[PDB]
Design a protein around this ligand. Structure first.
Ligand SMILES: [Zn+2]
Ligand SMILES: [Zn+2]
Lengths: 141, 49, 204, 96, 116, 122
């Protein structure tokens, strides 16, 4: 098995697996997530690599349970399910990815950006795209 | 590229990078990038005359 | 190859580190095997670590319920006499390099996994060497779990911690064998020696 | 053209680099030896080298014959850019 | 050749395999609903240890219109007969022993690629 | 010179080996008592092993596969023609001798190649 894709959210004391993050955005459906991540369903080696960190996440399906799962690990976790849900929702809408947009709703593009990150990670893993160089000043300001 | 070389809407500071191995096009307009001027070759001659 | 000489080696020697950067062993062959590389590579294979993943070419799991159905063309099942198997084919060249044979690979698998699994092996004569492994007594994924937990760490042949072994003829006279002749000269000799990449020093 | 037999114990890239480095080192050594043979008895580099006061024959070779091959971490110049060492070169060039 | 992926039609979910303990027929079932389907592949999971897979699948024909790539006239195109075609190596990792060049015809709307 | 036995598994192996000898029409061309030969090989294997365990069954299966394989009918030819004694074929080991010339050649060349593949150290 092994090879589980996870995330390290800001102001969250513990890492969380990815599919819980996607469902926290409200993507309860499963085909939507893989559409966001995999842009072509014809290469089996690419698509099989998400199964490890997809079978790890079948307990959580609804949005509220995902938000509570996130909030249980917050910097100041709530004492009520409403507190956990609102805290996790606020930290996702504000702290996570301000550059894509902090408008009233940005899930339609935040999900695509997370999918792009995961797709890049899988591309690096499969060897279809070499790693980035820290010394290259195209990557510096 | 043509609009930047005419310098009408895209200022000369903007850099357009197109990747071909992966179909991406990247555009940067932020501060801090380091750039130097260079001559332009059209086919095999110079635009400098 | 790499030996990491210089100041880092001095630090490793001064600060006695339970793990160095590049531990290795120089092995001298005792008998006539030190002279013919053919009878030294067998020792090399007896030394180097070899798991199942080193020899496997392709692997696949099928749901063939009827044993005589044989979803793939394999006449061996009929003469040999869970509804799913685990067909494993082995690369021929790697299989021969270790001077190994499937009849004992199956015995290793059976000894490792008890009676939970039953392995059927193709004969050496056939061009394609295959292994039909069937569990007999949530088991759909159990084959995947075991194969991911036996292919990597099986230890078909050799000893652990020895990543690779180099057969080498020394050029300098320091490692060359020295024997005083009958009339009294020194007459340095050249014999095969080996350089591992791990440390056992006891099984070796 | 895939007509390169891998050297015992070496990958294809490793043996390719081995032949390349061997050829380049042979060229450097031969040119240096020719330069040493060319020097006169009144030359000052030769006088200060043979006495061991300063310098060595490699310095004479680099001043006269050829500087040689540069390396970082014991290998030739790495592909700092994408599949090339400088913008003035062309992708996947392993020439001297 | 490979194991495909089938999606549940009701709730848009992965279809897990499920052997029929009575009919001895492999079937695909969801988990969020009592959905069943007939499995025709007769395969579950394959794995190629060698991983020596051809890379022509992802060789985009857009590579031809690139100015920083070599151009040669030694191996012309087979069909259109164009005399010039760019070439490049694996351009990817995992290559145990790869020095061959994957050619692409430098012709508009040709896309002819081959390995030598 | 095959003493008949009473063990059912032994006779099953004998008849399977005999039917294996029926492949390739070599027995028809020669005209020999292949059943007697099968009994002799089974008895020789039993003498070598002194048991009826996994080794018995896998050795019999290996011999059957070697005999009935059509890629090397020469071994069947020269075992039914009396070129090789039955006992030596019984004590035959693996494939290094009961093989065609092409497989022996490819094994030899891969053995020679692994020399260089395992030298290293410049
Ligand atoms: Zn469903
Ligand atoms: Zn063309």
């Amino acid at each position: 098995i092994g090879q589980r894709i996870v995330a390290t959210l800001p102001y969250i004391k513990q890492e969380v697996p990815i599919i819980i993050v996607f469902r926290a955005l409200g993507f309860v459906s499963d085909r939507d997530i893989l559409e966001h991540i995999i842009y072509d369903f014809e290469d089996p080696e690419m698509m099989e690599m998400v199964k490890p960190s997809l079978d790890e996440a079948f307990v959580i399906q609804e949005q509220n349970v995902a938000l509570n799962f996130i909030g249980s690990r917050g910097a100041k976790p709530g004492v009520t399910k409403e507190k956990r849900i609102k805290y996790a929702k606020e930290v996702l809408q504000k702290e996570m990815l301000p550059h894509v947009g902090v408008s009233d709703f940005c899930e339609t593009k935040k999900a695509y950006f997370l999918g792009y990150m995961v797709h890049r990670l899988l591309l690096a893993a499969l060897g279809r795209r070499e790693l980035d160089d820290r010394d290259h000043y195209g990557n510096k300001r | 590229r043509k609009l930047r070389r005419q310098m009408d809407i895209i200022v000369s500071e903007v850099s357009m990078i197109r990747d071909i191995r992966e179909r991406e096009i990247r555009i940067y307009t932020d501060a801090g990038r380091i750039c130097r001027p260079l001559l332009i070759v059209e086919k095999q001659k110079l635009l400098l005359k | 190859k790499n030996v990491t000489l210089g100041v880092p080696r001095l630090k490793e020697l001064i600060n006695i580190s339970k793990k160095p950067k590049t531990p290795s062993l120089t092995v001298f062959l005792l008998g006539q095997s030190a002279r013919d590389a053919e009878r030294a590579k067998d020792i090399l294979c007896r030394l180097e670590h070899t798991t199942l993943r080193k020899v496997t070419a392709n692997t696949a799991i099928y749901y063939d319920p009827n044993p005589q159905s044989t979803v793939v063309a394999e006449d061996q099942e009929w003469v040999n006499v869970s509804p799913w198997l685990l067909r494993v084919e082995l690369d021929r060249k790697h299989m021969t390099d270790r001077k190994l044979t499937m009849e004992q690979i199956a015995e290793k698998i059976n000894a490792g996994f008890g009676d939970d699994l039953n392995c059927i092996f193709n004969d050496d004569n056939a061009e394609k060497l295959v292994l039909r492994i069937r569990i007999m007594n949530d088991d759909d994924v159990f084959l995947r779990c075991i194969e991911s937990n036996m292919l990597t760490d099986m230890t078909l042949q050799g000893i652990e911690q020895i990543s690779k072994v180099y057969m080498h003829l020394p050029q300098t006279d320091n490692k060359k064998k020295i024997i005083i002749t009958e009339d009294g000269e020194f007459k340095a000799l050249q014999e095969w020696i080996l350089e591992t990449d791990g440390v056992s020093l006891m099984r070796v | 053209n895939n007509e390169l037999e891998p050297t015992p114990g070496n990958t294809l890239r490793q043996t390719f680099e081995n032949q390349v480095n061997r050829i380049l080192n042979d060229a450097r050594d031969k040119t240096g030896s020719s330069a040493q043979k060319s020097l006169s008895e009144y030359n000052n580099f030769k006088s200060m080298v043979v006495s061991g006061a300063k310098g060595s024959k490699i310095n004479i070779s680099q001043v006269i014959a050829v500087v040689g091959q540069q390396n970082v971490e014991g290998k030739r110049i790495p592909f700092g850019f994408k599949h090339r060492t400088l913008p003035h070169f062309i992708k996947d060039d392993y020439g001297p | 050749g490979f194991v495909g992926i089938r999606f549940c039609q009701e709730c848009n979910n992965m279809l897990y395999p499920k052997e029929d303990k009575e009919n001895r027929i492999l079937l695909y079932a969801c988990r969020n609903c009592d959905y069943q389907q007939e499995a025709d592949n007769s395969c579950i999971y394959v794995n190629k240890i060698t991983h020596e897979v051809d890379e022509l699948t992802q060789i985009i024909a857009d590579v031809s219109q690139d100015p920083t790539l070599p151009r040669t006239e030694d191996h012309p195109c087979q069909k259109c007969g164009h005399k010039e075609a760019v070439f490049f190596q694996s351009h990817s990792a995992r290559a145990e022993d790869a020095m061959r060049l994957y050619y692409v015809c430098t012709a508009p709307h040709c896309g002819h690629r081959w390995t030598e | 010179r095959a003493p008949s036995t009473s063990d059912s598994v032994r006779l099953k192996c004998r008849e399977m080996l005999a039917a294996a000898l029926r492949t390739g029409d070599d027995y028809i061309a020669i005209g020999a008592d292949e059943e007697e030969l099968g009994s002799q090989i089974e008895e020789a294997i039993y003498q070598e092993i002194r048991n009826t365990d996994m080794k018995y069954k896998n050795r019999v299966r290996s011999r059957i596969s070697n005999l009935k394989d059509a890629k090397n009918p020469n071994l069947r030819k020269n075992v039914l023609c009396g070129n090789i004694p039955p006992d030596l074929f019984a004590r035959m080991t693996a494939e290094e001798m009961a093989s065609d010339e092409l497989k022996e050649m490819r094994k030899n060349l891969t053995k020679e190649a692994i020399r260089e593949h395992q030298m290293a150290k410049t």
